[PDB]
């Protein structure tokens, strides 16, 4: 996260760290959506241009964390993967269309003050909140600058941007399965996700029922916090029928 701030304790209790077993390193962010299911970006698991293709046993999920590097004894919980599910129409060849994946845990995680799931939006909360100008919140342990790493989880609030401005900011083809967020050059304020924030959540607090909903997934950007560029997020509601199908099918 560029130009964000340290998270408060328990501010993002659905935050998940994707951790490589050997060598031990951060791989991505992710989010807790139930006691057995974790949501992330497909490119965190599968991205052939970079020779990335992880299998369940290559990975761990670390839940309840605040510090990036320390082992947070009696607070974080570490879980093994039963199965990875990537969207069958994830487009890694071109533009990361449908950049979404699910991970099922081998065992349910115990909720605590630091570990708690986020809601997924229904059609109406999405239609009400996914509007240009409305702000969401992005969190992660990724780079502090485009070209270092934070001591603790970082947070930044960013406005959703009008789709024509998103489209006009880039030569990549954008789709309805994406939205973009970030300040414009003339807006004074800045902030972005960056490398290592991949797969983490973009959340909004509904003013109707005061619950947090995950509207996006950190997907892609061209640089980090560049003027006139915007961060792109997977549109969770547009892909929810897939999410539900998987969870309904596989438990």
């Amino acid at each position: 996260i560029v130009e964000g701030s340290d998270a408060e304790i328990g501010m993002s209790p659905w935050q998940v760290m994707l951790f490589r077993k050997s060598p031990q390193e951060l791989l991505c962010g992710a989010s807790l959506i139930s006691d057995r299911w974790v949501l992330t970006a497909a490119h965190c698991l599968l991205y052939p241009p970079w020779d990335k293709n992880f299998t369940e046993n290559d990975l761990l999920v670390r839940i309840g964390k605040h510090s990036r590097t320390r082992y947070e004894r009696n607070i974080e919980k570490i879980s093994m993967l039963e199965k990875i599910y990537i969207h069958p129409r994830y487009n890694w060849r071109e533009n990361l269309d449908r950049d979404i994946a699910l991970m099922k845990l081998k065992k349910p995680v115990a909720f605590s003050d630091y570990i708690h799931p986020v809601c997924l939006p229904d059609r109406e909360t999405a239609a009400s909140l996914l509007q240009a100008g409305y702000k969401g919140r992005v969190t992660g342990w990724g780079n502090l600058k485009e070209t270092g790493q934070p001591s603790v989880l970082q947070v930044v609030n960013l406005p959703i941007v009008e789709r024509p401005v998103c489209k006009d900011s880039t030569r990549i083809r954008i789709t309805d399965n994406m939205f973009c967020a970030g300040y414009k050059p003339d807006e004074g304020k800045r902030g972005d996700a960056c490398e290592g924030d991949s797969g983490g959540p973009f959340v909004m607090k509904s003013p109707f029922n005061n619950r947090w909903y995950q509207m996006g997934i950190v997907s892609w950007g061209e640089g980090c916090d560049r003027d006139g560029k915007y961060g792109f997020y997977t549109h969770v509601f547009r892909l929810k029928k897939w999410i539900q199908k998987v969870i309904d099918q596989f438990g």
Binding site: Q24, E25, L60, Y71, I78
Partner: peptide, 10 residues
């Protein structure tokens, strides 16, 4: 850079 985690998890 990372503190090692319990062997149990590996």
């Amino acid at each position: 850079d990372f503190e090692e985690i319990p062997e149990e998890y590996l």
